[PDB]
Amino acid sequence: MSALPPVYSFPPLYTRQPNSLTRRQQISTWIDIISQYCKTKKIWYMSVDGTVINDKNLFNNEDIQRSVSQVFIDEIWSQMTKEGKCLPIDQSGRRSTTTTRYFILWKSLDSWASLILQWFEDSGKLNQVITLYELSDETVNWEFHRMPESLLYYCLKPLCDRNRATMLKDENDKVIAIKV
Amino acid sequence: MSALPPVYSFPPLYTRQPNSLTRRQQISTWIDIISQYCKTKKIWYMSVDGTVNLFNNEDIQRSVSQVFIDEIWSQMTKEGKCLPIDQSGRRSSNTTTTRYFILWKSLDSWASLILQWFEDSGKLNQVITLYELSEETVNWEFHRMPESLLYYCLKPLCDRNRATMLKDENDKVIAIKVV
């Protein structure tokens, strides 16, 4: 129960800082604000310009009348990407081939992998075949509930490695369900 | 969460901001940094100048002006995030407040957690001292809290008629019973 910080309204933050050292910190702060934000609002996608997609822009502070330059924002993303805090995706899968938006990873993919895997066991379904769609129905209500399927797919992949699961695709080789 | 946020190293923060609006936020950010710091390092006292220090960033080579710091404290005091005290107990600004009791947890809040322990330990009728309350049965967030400050968290219990305090020959609260 938190979302946006008090520093989120501190102007000097929106101004990029000339200084390898400083900028390095300032960016972390932003990285951090992002995760915390998406996390509490249970959001998953962020457009490169900061727009939030809903299963509303975080770099444009209306109240403070300030906005982070795209130039900086980009620095923010890469940095966040280098750190594994976000995932570059295009009109669908992992791409940073015209990456259009980001999958904010406040929880590692492997981490999500576990929590989902967990669910499966903590619900005995550890042998059945459930779809990704139902993965986000009434039965689910762990942090990952409502997570897009495309992104859900990336959280399950870890289960395919670690040989704990097998995915099932439809006629158009699209993952639709999975058995763990 | 560490003792210091990433913003703790963001210079612009140490510079006071000319602006009722802005400063107001900047201060909250500092208030916040303090609580969070003290909380995780399980610290309780902070000297007005910041000695825990926390206002003098060595790595960043930057330090908040006392002027600002004072604004920080009052603001933090208005909010009830801290408690002003002289070498003794609660003591107002001028009235020689020498240090602060950082309230990362409201007094009423602490009040509850302590009350809680009592019930969660059935001792809800006995007479335990503040010393034992701080120093081998206690291990909730309040474990190790100074007695003087512990006293202020129990007071709420005297109000709400849930407890009675017992002082020694030198009218010093030593124990308490919170039936």
Side-chain angles (χ1 to χ4, degrees), chain A residues 2-180, chain B residues 2-179:
Chain A
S2 316
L4 283 144
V7 71
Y8 181 74
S9 285
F10 181 54
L13 191 69
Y14 296 59
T15 304
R16 178 174 176 290
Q17 291 302 299
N19 185 323
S20 192
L21 298 177
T22 298
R23 189 184 318 99
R24 175 61 180 299
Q25 294 302 173
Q26 171 167 45
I27 299 177
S28 290
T29 291
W30 270 104
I31 307 263
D32 183 302
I33 292 183
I34 306 297
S35 312
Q36 263 311 305
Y37 181 95
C38 299
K39 175 180 182 182
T40 86
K41 290 215 168 300
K42 284 294 169 291
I43 275 188
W44 313 97
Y45 288 122
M46 280 262 272
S47 67
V48 314
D49 70 359
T51 306
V52 314
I53 340 290
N54 295 299
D55 65 300
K56 42 288 130 295
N57 181 277
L58 193 64
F59 289 135
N60 196 306
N61 188 314
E62 309 298 358
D63 307 358
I64 290 305
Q65 300 192 310
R66 281 304 203 79
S67 282
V68 182
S69 75
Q70 184 57 50
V71 176
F72 197 16
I73 301 174
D74 297 313
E75 288 174 288
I76 308 297
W77 288 131
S78 55
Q79 179 58 65
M80 188 173 211
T81 324
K82 186 187 296 182
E83 296 186 6
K85 310 286 181 60
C86 64
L87 185 64
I89 55 192
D90 54 27
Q91 58 181 60
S92 31
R94 195 217 201 75
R95 292 294 182 179
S96 50
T97 53
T98 297
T99 148
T100 190
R101 62 228 279 148
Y102 295 84
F103 179 6
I104 308 295
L105 266 38
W106 18 287
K107 200 152 185 54
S108 163
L109 285 183
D110 282 358
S111 178
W112 282 112
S114 300
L115 175 56
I116 303 175
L117 162 55
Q118 215 254 183
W119 177 85
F120 274 92
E121 306 181 315
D122 278 45
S123 301
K125 303 187 180 185
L126 186 58
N127 185 61
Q128 292 154 269
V129 176
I130 171 179
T131 44
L132 311 177
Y133 173 102
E134 196 184 73
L135 218 47
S136 61
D137 204 331
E138 306 301 303
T139 323
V140 288
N141 198 59
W142 286 224
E143 301 186 4
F144 65 75
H145 177 59
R146 266 302 179 57
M147 181 195 263
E149 303 190 18
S150 70
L151 306 189
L152 196 37
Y153 165 77
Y154 288 94
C155 294
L156 293 151
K157 195 72 181 51
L159 261 36
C160 291
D161 306 345
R162 299 180 64 279
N163 316 54
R164 301 278 292 87
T166 325
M167 296 188 277
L168 315 183
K169 60 199 187 305
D170 68 9
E171 67 177 2
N172 304 104
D173 305 71
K174 174 186 182 190
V175 168
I176 297 309
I178 190 183
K179 56 188 181 65
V180 309
Chain B
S2 291
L4 305 171
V7 72
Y8 181 75
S9 288
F10 182 54
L13 192 66
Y14 295 59
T15 305
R16 180 176 175 286
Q17 290 304 298
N19 186 326
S20 192
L21 298 178
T22 300
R23 188 185 317 102
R24 175 61 181 299
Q25 295 299 173
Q26 173 168 44
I27 298 177
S28 295
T29 290
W30 269 104
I31 307 261
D32 185 300
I33 292 183
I34 307 299
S35 308
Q36 265 310 307
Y37 182 93
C38 296
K39 174 180 181 185
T40 87
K41 288 213 170 303
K42 284 295 168 292
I43 278 191
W44 314 96
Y45 287 122
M46 281 260 276
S47 66
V48 313
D49 70 0
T51 304
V52 201
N53 190 184
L54 189 62
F55 286 142
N56 194 307
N57 190 310
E58 308 297 358
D59 309 0
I60 292 304
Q61 300 193 309
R62 281 307 202 77
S63 282
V64 184
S65 77
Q66 184 54 49
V67 176
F68 196 20
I69 304 169
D70 295 315
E71 293 177 289
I72 307 299
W73 288 130
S74 55
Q75 177 58 62
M76 190 173 209
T77 320
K78 182 189 295 185
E79 292 184 11
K81 305 292 182 58
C82 64
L83 186 58
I85 56 193
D86 61 303
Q87 183 181 60
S88 68
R90 204 183 295 204
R91 235 64 177 181
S92 175
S93 179
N94 189 181
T95 65
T96 312
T97 149
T98 187
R99 61 228 276 152
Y100 294 86
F101 176 9
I102 307 299
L103 270 42
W104 22 286
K105 201 154 182 54
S106 157
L107 287 183
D108 281 357
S109 174
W110 282 116
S112 297
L113 174 56
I114 301 180
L115 164 54
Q116 214 256 186
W117 174 87
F118 274 91
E119 307 182 314
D120 276 48
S121 303
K123 303 185 180 183
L124 185 58
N125 186 62
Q126 292 150 269
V127 174
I128 170 177
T129 43
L130 308 181
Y131 172 103
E132 195 185 73
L133 216 48
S134 156
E135 316 304 306
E136 60 179 60
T137 314
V138 288
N139 199 57
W140 287 224
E141 299 186 3
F142 65 72
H143 178 62
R144 265 298 178 61
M145 179 191 266
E147 302 195 17
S148 69
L149 307 188
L150 193 34
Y151 164 79
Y152 288 96
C153 307
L154 293 151
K155 196 68 180 56
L157 261 37
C158 293
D159 305 347
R160 299 179 63 278
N161 316 52
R162 301 279 292 91
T164 326
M165 297 189 275
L166 316 184
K167 62 205 184 303
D168 70 8
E169 70 176 0
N170 303 101
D171 303 70
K172 175 187 179 187
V173 169
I174 299 307
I176 190 184
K177 55 187 183 65
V178 308
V179 178

